[PDB]
Design an enzyme around this catalytic site. Structure first.
Site, short mmCIF file in Angstrom:
data_model
loop_
_atom_site.label_atom_id
_atom_site.label_comp_id
_atom_site.label_asym_id
_atom_site.label_seq_id
_atom_site.Cartn_x
_atom_site.Cartn_y
_atom_site.Cartn_z
N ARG A 149 -1.09 -5.80 12.33
CA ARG A 149 -2.06 -5.08 13.19
C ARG A 149 -2.11 -6.14 14.46
O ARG A 149 -2.33 -5.78 15.47
CB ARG A 149 -3.25 -4.66 12.60
CG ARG A 149 -2.89 -3.47 11.69
CD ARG A 149 -4.14 -2.75 11.12
NE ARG A 149 -3.64 -1.38 10.61
CZ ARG A 149 -4.37 -0.68 9.86
NH1 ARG A 149 -5.57 -1.22 9.77
NH2 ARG A 149 -3.97 0.35 9.34
N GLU B 24 -8.33 -0.42 14.29
CA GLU B 24 -9.03 -1.20 13.47
C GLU B 24 -7.80 -2.44 12.98
O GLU B 24 -6.72 -2.24 12.80
CB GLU B 24 -9.59 -0.67 12.03
CG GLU B 24 -9.36 -1.56 10.89
CD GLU B 24 -9.62 -1.37 9.51
OE1 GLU B 24 -9.81 -2.03 8.52
OE2 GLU B 24 -9.61 0.15 9.55
N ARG C 271 0.99 1.33 10.52
CA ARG C 271 0.56 1.81 9.19
C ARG C 271 1.61 1.69 8.45
O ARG C 271 2.93 2.50 8.69
CB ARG C 271 0.18 3.46 9.13
CG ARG C 271 -0.44 3.99 7.93
CD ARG C 271 -1.06 4.98 8.13
NE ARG C 271 -2.58 4.46 8.64
CZ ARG C 271 -3.30 5.25 9.43
NH1 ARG C 271 -2.86 6.43 9.98
NH2 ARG C 271 -4.42 4.95 9.72
N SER D 243 -11.58 -5.80 8.80
CA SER D 243 -12.68 -5.17 8.10
C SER D 243 -13.46 -6.33 7.25
O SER D 243 -12.74 -7.12 6.73
CB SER D 243 -12.34 -3.92 7.35
OG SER D 243 -12.96 -3.60 6.29
N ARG E 110 0.74 -1.21 -0.08
CA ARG E 110 0.07 -0.11 0.05
C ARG E 110 0.82 1.27 0.06
O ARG E 110 1.72 1.37 0.73
CB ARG E 110 -1.03 -0.10 1.20
CG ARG E 110 -2.12 -1.00 1.09
CD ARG E 110 -2.93 -0.98 2.43
NE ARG E 110 -4.24 -0.69 2.26
CZ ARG E 110 -4.85 0.50 2.24
NH1 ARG E 110 -3.78 1.52 2.08
NH2 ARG E 110 -5.90 0.84 1.92
#
Lengths: 448, 448
Positions: free
Chosen positions: B412, B370, B298, B373, B283
């Protein structure tokens, strides 16, 4: 990168190696390097001549400060020296580049144990292991490659190739991968996915036990670490670059593992540094037209656990032997018959000073295929990435020696296991070693 | 992509949905499409009109070929008819383009149960689970985000952040990664590496138990599979493209998992298709200036096990609920407290019709973050990738619904395990369920 001292102290030794490697197009560089190395040092001599001069012309103006001081001239010869000095300095700065340009593009000097050769048909089998299951129709070819030095067992029925086995086992989808990503890509499925992770952990556990620190590095790196790990030719042949970024997809955990200590000075007491990395590997496979289409042997992506070693120049070779053995131990446990090979000069490659490959017997193809590769890079990478070390903080830091070697590149190991442990009906038995990781003990084909 | 029949039959429905989404600008499009779609349909009419007229004017000149054949006037019309047909044909092509341009950019129609909101602040908690450890200093924020509907205990000492923990534990080196690749990259080490692989395996195991087909997909795909899985906005913001190649680095095993059945007609009998992929994820993280610098939360790359589901339109909602729960189950066994929130129109996204996120309580950060999802994309992706199904070979093929959900994104998951199972001395206790995979039960600090 080659050591300027080496070219200066034995151009013939280098020139001959360039020829053993088949890089004649470059022998003419050796002379051109000295040609320049020479102009470089005389210009240095001149600058110093010049610096000493300004000192003399300086005191002289002083002596005249008491005399008639007709120093209008001296103050002109001064402005000249300073004009000259800079120009020379710049001229020198230019020579160092042209010199370096060539040095970065010369292959590491081969060790004398490297057999001289043209291509891979000249590599040299130096050790064998295991009982090869051989199809009747391969008998002669097998024996030529084994030199009769390998034990075997004949098979009446014909062994299947891994591509077919994968299909009957429900282990992969090639069609769709091609639809989504083009050729030489794949979708691994079911048991085969576990098997893959299975081989990673296995490789991981072993190297860790032998005292290697496990590392997951970045899959994308800055151009300099790629320039410091292989030859500039790989940038077209194998490495993928991402658009608008100084980011390159690593073709092996080796590279980021090497760039890890770029521009440092290690404490000789920590040496050797032992790393075992895990990472997906991306390769362009641009040179391959149609040598291994459809399958998972010669692909654009795969997983590989790699051994990387930072050592002092005196322990490197002993280490080179250590890692290839670490690699050998794994396949023996996987009950995968193989043969270690000493790669000749022509097929050796720029980075390695000496290379050992483990080619596994492939009951289906009826030939040995590379499965792991162990290289000693001596100081070639070091010199590029500026990786030096010192024993006592007192003086001169020396370049370290780096070594790399596959532990298990999952894609090619899966082929090995698939072809080597299959049975008439297509069933593939998993080596006992991997049972704790896989769960299942064999992989039966769909339709039962 | 939205069905033009939807825009024709129920313009108001989509305008109103667009408004809830607060995409006041795009609301204009619905009228524009309708207009252009009309001009399109009409000109399509006139074309056939002429094609038919040309035929009639053709036979008529033949009948006069026997008569006085005063076909000079009747001949000049045949030349204008075709000239006209060609003008229309081209006008039509240019309209479809303008139309598809909008149809490919409208967001999916949201389900009624989607709460109306503007940003992530109007998102709604709907369940909690676990007993959180809260720093006395984070008491307010914690009651704020928990609404006091969640159990907990106050901590007199201050829980550390994962970045620190990672350092005192010797499980990552960020300095060197920044050297080698840049910010938002990292090197994972020792017990952390094994923990990363253990999470992947653990999620894969539990999903296979539940009937999902495990798959390792291509990590690089063609532009069409990307344009088919997300809105075009993601190309600038999230997706990396490889130089000179029609290949894009995948940000989630979801995309190739969706491309896999592009342009197919599945056999209803087989629905639902349950896939669980594993893959590295890349990403760009271009929109984040400095919200989560240094650490592994991140980042540009991470590993993630994803759930993908090809479902019959009438069972998609039952599945949207099944997968979010599958993920929960994981974190629960993982002993990570959390809360699951229902995303509102504003922070929804373009492909989902509804979406649940699981936000893990982060003891040190003092807030919920988070970790997974899960979305139901209904027919948005299917319409773009042309994925349909049929039960009877007789009937017209219907578009299937697609859904996806995180199982575990290692990065995460690791920060949660770290910040949540940390003791005062900094050692981290691995939850019991992960023991069969790690071997070790805790990670004690390095002495330095």
């Amino acid at each position: 990168m080659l050591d300027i001292k080496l070219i200066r102290e034995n151009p013939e030794l280098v020139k001959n190696d360039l020829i053993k490697r088949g890089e004649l197009e470059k022998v003419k560089w050796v002379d051109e390097i000295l040609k320049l190395d020479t102009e470089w040092r005389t210009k240095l001599k001149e600058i110093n001549r010049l610096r000493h001069e300004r000192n003399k012309i300086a005191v002289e103006i002083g002596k005249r400060r008491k005399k008639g001081e007709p120093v209008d001239e001296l103050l002109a010869k001064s402005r000249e020296i300073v004009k000259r000095i800079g120009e020379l300095e710049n001229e020198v700065e230019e020579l160092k580049k042209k010199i370096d340009y060539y040095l970065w593009r010369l292959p590491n000097i081969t060790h004398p144990s490297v057999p001289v050769g043209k291509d891979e048909n000249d590599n040299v089998p130096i050790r064998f292991w295991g009982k090869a299951r051989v199809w009747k129709g391969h008998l002669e070819r097998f024996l030529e490659q084994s030199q009769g030095k390998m034990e075997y067992e004949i098979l009446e029925w014909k062994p299947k190739l891994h591509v077919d086995l994968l299909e009957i086992l429900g282990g992969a989808d090639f069609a769709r991968a091609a639809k989504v990503s083009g050729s030489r890509f794949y979708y691994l499925l079911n048991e085969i996915v576990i098997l893959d992770l299975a081989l990673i952990r296995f490789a991981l556990d072993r190297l860790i036990e032998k005292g290697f620190t496990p590392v997951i590095p970045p899959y994308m790196v800055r151009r300099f670490v790629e320039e410091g790990s292989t030859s500039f030719e790989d940038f077209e042949d194998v490495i993928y670059k991402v658009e608008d970024e100084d980011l390159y997809l690593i073709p092996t955990a080796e590279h980021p593992l090497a760039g890890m200590h770029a521009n440092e000075i290690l404490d000789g007491k920590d040496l050797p540094l032992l790393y075992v990395g895990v990472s997906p590997c991306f390769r362009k496979e641009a040179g391959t037209a149609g040598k291994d289409t459809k399958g998972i042997f010669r692909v654009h992506q795969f997983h590989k656990v790699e051994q990387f070693v930072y050592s002092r120049p005196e322990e490197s070779w002993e280490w080179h032997e250590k890692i290839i053995r670490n690699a050998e131990e794994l396949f023996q446990e996987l009950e995968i018959p193989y043969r270690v090979v000493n790669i000749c000069t022509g097929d050796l490659g720029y980075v390695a000073a000496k290379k050992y490959d483990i080619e596994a017997w492939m009951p289906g193809q009826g030939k040995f295929r590379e499965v792991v590769s162990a290289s000693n890079c001596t100081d070639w990478q070091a010199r590029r990435l500026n990786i030096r070390f010192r024993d006592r903080t007192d003086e001169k830091p020396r370049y370290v020696h780096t070594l790399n070697s596959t532990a298990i590149a999952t894609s090619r190991a899966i082929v090995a296991i698939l072809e080597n442990h299959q049975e008439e009906d297509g069933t593939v038995r998993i080596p006992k070693v991997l049972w704790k990781y896989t769960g299942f003990k064999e992989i039966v084909p769909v339709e039962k």
